[PDB]
Symmetry: none
Subunit: 105 residues, 15 copies
């Protein structure tokens, strides 16, 4: 029930996007194959490192995760933008994984 | 009319979710096969142990049980969240059981 | 016109549900086979014993009995719950009987 | 024009229902076979005896009798209960009779 | 033009219904066979005797007679009961007669 | 043009109905066969005798006669009863006559 | 043009109806056969004699005569009765005549 | 152009109707056969004689004559009676004439 | 163009109708055969003579003449009578003429 | 273009209608055959002579002449009479002429 | 383009209608055959002479001339008469002309 | 582009219509054949001479000329008369011309 | 791109229309064949000379020219006249030109 | 990406239209073939020279150019004229170019 | 995931458009082929150099870039112009690129 989630975040003109706050949280509870069946949503994690990389190894369920790394500003309903969060379903394997995106079809 | 209900609750990034209050209660009364026919609803139980495990052995009926382990906050009808209770029907066997969930179909 | 009505009431996690008040009462009058034709409703009985058992032997009619053993609280029409009474029709035999329930079909 | 009307009234859990007031009255006048043709309604009788038995021998007509043995309480139209009177048509024979009921069909 | 009208009135539980006032009256005038053609209505008679019997011998016409032996109470239109009068058409013979009733068909 | 009109009036339980006022009157004028053609209405006669009999011999016409022997009471239109007058058409013969009634058909 | 009009008026129970005023009058003028053609209406005559008889001999025309012998009382339109006048057309012959009435057809 | 108009007027019960005023008048002017063509209406004549007879001899025209011999009373339009005038067309011959009436057809 | 217009006017019961004023007048102008073509209306003439005769000899035209010999009374439109004028068309011949009337057809 | 217009006017009962004013006038201008084509209307002439005759000789045109010899009275529109004028078209010849009238067709 | 217009005007009973004013005027301008093409309307001329004759010689055009010789009176629109003017189209020839009228067709 | 426009104006009864003002003016500009293509409207000319004649020689175009020789009076729109102007299109030739009119078709 | 625009303006009765102001102006810009493609509108020129002639040589384009030589008066919209300007499209040749008009079709 | 834009502007009657301000500006940005792909609009240039000529060599794109050489006056929306600007699309070649206009189709 | 984005900006009449501020920014986040999958929008860059050239090498994604080099003025919604920004999708190659525009189709 472990799968490291290494990713790269070098965003501007080759620059590696060094230390910056990183956030992730489960959407709704889900059950994996047998041993890891529970998993209510919760949130954690900070920092991005110099190379722009983050890693954890609990993806075994069948629910969806949402990533909201970017910190920005917002106001009274007239700012439906400036936020660039993404979502990705939970992978199920024992190997390095990457991309695995669910952008607008 | 006995069936142990061992379960695992290691929720965050591999962490085993040590001692925490655990609650369970019958929804409506039900009758099992012969010897255990009555069972009005009632509530009990506390603690989760270091490994996040709980066990009892009376599941023989045909009603539904609800689990509400997580303790959280709530207010005047504008908090339809923060609670992550689940439900599971009563299993009928003499062996260890697990998963046995009734999440949204 | 005699039939003992032995029952078991061990409700919580194997516990036998020792002494507690027990109530039963006929709904409407009914007539049995010949010798026991009259039987207007009335109420009686207390105690449940350590094993949670009660016995009497007059079930011969064709009416319905209601059992309301549980003692609880109630208030002004905003408590349509906390009461877990059941009903059972009158059995007709000379032998130990059990279950014989009329829960929601 | 004579027929004894022996009956049994052992109501609670085998108990014989000893002495208690007993009432009966003809509903409307009726005529029997020849010799006993008149019979305007009237009321009489008390006591039930230890065994719960009552006897009289004038049933020969074709009208209906009503029995109202139970004594109870009543109030201003908000007590359509607590009374458990019955009715029975007039039998025509020369022998012991019993049951002969007209409960809700 | 004569016919005795012997009747029996032993009403309660074999009791012969001794002396009590007895009333009878013609409804409307009628004519018999020849010799007795006139008969305007009128009323008479008292007493019932120990055996509850009354006799007279003028029934020859074709009209209706009404019997109102029972004495009772009545009040302002809210007592459409307590009176148990009957009616019988005029018999035509020379012999003892009885029953000859016109109760609700 | 003569016909005696003997009649009997023994009304109560064989009693002959002795002396009592008797009245008769022609309704409308009428003409008989030849010799007795005129006859305007008029009224007369009293007494009934011990046997209850009356006699006269002028019935020859074709009109109607009305008999109102009974004397009674009456008041303001709320007594459409207590009067038992009858009517009979005029017979035409020379012999004793009787009945000859015109009661409600 | 002459025809005697003898009539009889013995009205009550054989009585001959002695002296009483008698009236007759032509309705409208009419003409007979030749010699007696004129005859405007007019009125005359009194008395009836012991036998109740009247005679005159001018009936030859074709009009109608009205007889109003009876004397009575009358008032303001609420007495359409008590008068028993008759009518008869004029006979044409030379012989005694009688009846010759025109009562309601 | 002459025709005597003898008539008889013996009206009551053979009586000849002696002297009484007699009136006649032409309705509208008319012309006869040749010699007597003019004749505007006018009125004349009185008396009836003992026998009730009147005579004149000018009837030759084709108009109508009206006779109004009877003298009577009249008032304000509520007396459309008491007058018994007649009418007759003009006869054309030389001989005694009579009747010749025009009463209601 | 001359035609004498002799006429007779003996009106009442043979009487010759002596001297009385006589009037005649042309209605509208008309033309005769040749020599007498003009003739505007005008009026003249008086007296009737003892025999009731008048004569003139100018009738040759084709118009109408009106004769109004009778003198009478008249008032405000409620006397459409009492005047008995006549009319006659103009005759055309040479001989005595008479009648020649135009009374209502 | 000359034609004498001799006429006669002896109007009353043969009388010649001596001297009286006579009037004539052309209605509308008209043209004759060649030599006399103009003729606007104008009026002239008086007197009638003893014989009632008038003469002139210019009738050659095709228009209408009106003659109004009679002198009379008239008032405010309630006298559409008393005037007896006539009209005649213009004759065309050389000879005595007469009649030649245009009275109502 | 010359044509004398001699005319005669002897109007009354042969009289020649001596000296009187005479008027004529062109209605609207018109053109003749070649040499005389212009001719705007204008008015002239007086006197009629003893014989009633007038002459001029310019009629060559195709327009209409109006003659209004008669002098009369007129007032405010209630005199549509007393004027007897005529009209005539222009003749085209070299010879005496006459009539040539355009009276109402 | 020259054409003399000699005309004659002897209007009254042969009179030559000596000296009088004469007016002419082009309606709208027009173009002739080549050499004379322009010709905006303008007005000129006076006098008529003793014979009533006028002459000019520029008619070569295709427009319309209007002649208004007559001098008269006019007032506020209630004088749609007294003016007798004419119109004529431009002739195209080299010779004397005349008539050439455009009066109402 | 040169074309002389000689014209003649001898307007009145042969008169040559000596010196007078002459105006011309391009309506809208247009392009000729190649070398002379531009030509925005502008205005110039005066004088007409004794013969009434004007000349210039730039007509090569395809637009329209307007000529407004006549000088006149005008006022507030109630003078839609007195101006006799014309228009002509641009000719394209190398030779004398004339007429070339665009008067109302 | 170079193309000289020589043009001629000799506008009035052959005159070369010497020095005058000249303006040109790109309407909207456009891209040429490869090397010259950008070209946002901008404005420049003055003077026209004696011959009325202007030259530049950057026309390579596919957008539209507008020329507004003429200087004039304008006011508040009631002067939609006096300006004679033109437009021309960008030519693509290496040679002298001219005309190349987009006047109203 | 590198592609240099060399461009040329020589805008006016051959001039190279030397140093001027240059701006570019990603519209929305997008993912490239594998290694460069993230790229949230951000903005950077200044200066244009003497030749008008800019270069960077991160275009590997599939989103859109917007270029807003020109600096201008703007005001309250009544200046929907003066800005000449463009857009271009992200190219995917390893070579010099140019044009690659998305101007109005």
């Amino acid at each position: 029930m472990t799968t490291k989630v290494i990713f790269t975040f070098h965003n501007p003109d080759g620059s590696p996007q060094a230390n910056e706050k990183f956030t992730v949280r489960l959407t709704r509870p889900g059950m994996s194959d047998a041993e890891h069946c529970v998993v209510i949503p919760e949130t954690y994690e900070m920092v991005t490192d110099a190379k722009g990389e983050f890693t954890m190894d609990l993806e075994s369920s069948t629910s969806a995760y949402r990533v909201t790394a970017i910190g920005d500003d917002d106001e009274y309903e007239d700012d439906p933008c400036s936020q660039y969060t993404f979502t990705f379903y939970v992978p199920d394997s024992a190997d390095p994984v990457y991309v695995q995106e669910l952008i607008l079809m």
